[PDB]
Amino acid sequence: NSNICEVCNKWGRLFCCDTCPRSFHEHCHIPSVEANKNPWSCIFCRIKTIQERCPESQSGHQESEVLMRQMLPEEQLKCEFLLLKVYCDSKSCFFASEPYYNREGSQGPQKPMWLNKVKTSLNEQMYTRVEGFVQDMRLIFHNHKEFYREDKFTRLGIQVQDIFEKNFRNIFAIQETS
Numbered sequence: 001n002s003n004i005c006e007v008c009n010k011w012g013r014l015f016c017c018d019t020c021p022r023s024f025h026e027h028c029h030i031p032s033v034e035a036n037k038n039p040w041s042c043i044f045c046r047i048k049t050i051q052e053r054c055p056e057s058q059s060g061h062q063e064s065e066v067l068m069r070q071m072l073p074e075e076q077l078k079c080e081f082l083l084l085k086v087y088c089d090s091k092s093c094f095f096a097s098e099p100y101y102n103r104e105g106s107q108g109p110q111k112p113m114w115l116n117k118v119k120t121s122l123n124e125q126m127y128t129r130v131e132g133f134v135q136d137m138r139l140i141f142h143n144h145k146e147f148y149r150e151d152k153f154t155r156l157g158i159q160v161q162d163i164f165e166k167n168f169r170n171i172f173a174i175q176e177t178s
């Protein structure tokens, strides 16, 4: 197995996947690494299994159909993985914890949002459809773009949004377009 966490790239107290060489800190894995379960398979392996079981799940989909899906176990897992893929980027630090807004010439957003809040919401089964999860995720970046205006720091929102959107199109097998 790897000797660093797959998500944050640090050593420490790591739990090892039994079916691939990845390793995780307890709360870096989403969901948090389970108390028992030998063998244990990580989220990457669980997602791979879904694709393997149903190869046709990789044929192209319309975003609108994806967003209306109810959050049954497989869609819950996919949104957990997509959240995890955003945490995998180091620039996620900027969006992880609860933000505050006091900048001359801007007003804070009406509905602040952050990754740890989305994490909690997923853990508490608060989203009933994929749409709920994706709306909160996109709201993170949209709030950032609006607040930081022409400051170059706005680009961090663009960059982390691009990682979210690429992973969304991959995980949920959105139909490729130009």
Ligand SMILES: [Zn+2]
Pocket (backbone or CB within 6 Å): 005, 006, 007, 008, 009, 010, 024, 025, 028
């Ligand atoms: Zn970690």
Ligand SMILES: [Zn+2]
Pocket (backbone or CB within 6 Å): 017, 018, 019, 020, 021, 022, 041, 042, 043, 044, 045
């Ligand atoms: Zn694995």
Ligand SMILES: [Zn+2]
Pocket (backbone or CB within 6 Å): 053, 054, 055, 056, 057
């Ligand atoms: Zn099938």
